[PDB]
Amino acid sequence: PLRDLDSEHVSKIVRLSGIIISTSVLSSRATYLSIMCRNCRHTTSITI
Amino acid sequence: PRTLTAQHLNKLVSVEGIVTKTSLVRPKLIRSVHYAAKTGRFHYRDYTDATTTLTTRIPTPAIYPTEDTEGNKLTTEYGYSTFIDHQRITVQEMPEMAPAGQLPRSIDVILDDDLVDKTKPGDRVNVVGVFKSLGAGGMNQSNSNTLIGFKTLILGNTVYPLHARSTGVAARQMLTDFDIRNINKLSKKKDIFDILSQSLA
Ligand SMILES: [Zn+2]
């Protein structure tokens, strides 16, 4: 039950049941970034 | 060099003196060219510093590129890059004009490209250029020290060697057609040896 979750379950895997009442709008997050330095123009990359 | 003071800064001057020490002529990197093996393209970059222009500019310290904009490796093409010659010299007050018993004064002159090896140490020289200051005389940051001032030198554009007695610079005179005609005429007389001999001292 949703009312039975507590400290012992933190960071473990759980299975829960209920009813969806609200979904939000889609957001954007980065998975690969190409960056540059605005002074010396040194370039690199980042991966998520 | 003795009578060159802070009131002549940023103005065009002409100085006389004796060359005391030159420097090794070095190349300066201006444009680099590279190659990417994964794409087959050639790239380049330009470089500049504070002594290549008379007016102050906002610095743009670009780095030397080793990679591509997409991460690929690059290869340097030394034959397609560009280098320019560079030298620095020192000029002192002439020994035949400086006061006796007094330590002398000197000034540095920077030359570039086609005026790079026009004199050797010990010559009497005349250099025309712009007397200019550079950097910050310990003003940026705290820099508690106050003894030093502003670095100064001459960005030269004209160098003239001068002939003197008992020096290594030889005298040469430009010969005009009037002179050539007169010489070739006098060559045809018969006492020319006598005339030329009696003229000495
Ligand atoms: Zn940077």
| Number of CB pairs, chain A paired with chain B, less than 8 A apart | 11
A43 touches chain B (CB under 8 A): yes
* Contacting residues for B168 by C-beta, under 8 A, at least 6 apart: B120, B122, B123
Cβ atoms of B35 and B72 within 8 Å: the answer is: no
Contacts of A32 in chain B (CB under 8 A): none
| Technique used by the depositors | cryo-EM
Q: Which residue has 């997409």 as its token pair?
A: B70
Closest alpha carbon to B27 in B89, B109, B115, B86: B86
Strand-pair category, B106-112 with B82-92: antiparallel
Q: Which residue has 């780095």 as its token pair?
A: B63
A39 with B71: Cβ contact below 8 A: no
* Contacting residues for B128 by C-beta, under 8 A, at least 6 apart: B12, B13, B14, B15, B156, B157, B158, B160
Q: Position B164: which residue type?
A: A
* Structure tokens belonging to residue B33: 């060219």
* Contacting residues for B13 by C-beta, under 8 A, at least 6 apart: B4, B128, B129, B130, B131, B154
Partner-chain residue, chosen from A39, A40, A43, that has the shortest CB–CB distance to B69: A43
In terms of residues, how long is chain A? 48
Q: What are phi and psi of B31, to 5 degrees?
A: -135, 130
* Structure tokens belonging to residue A13: 């895997």
CB-based burial of residue B49 (10 Å sphere; 0-12 exposed, 13-18 middle, 19+ buried)?
exposed
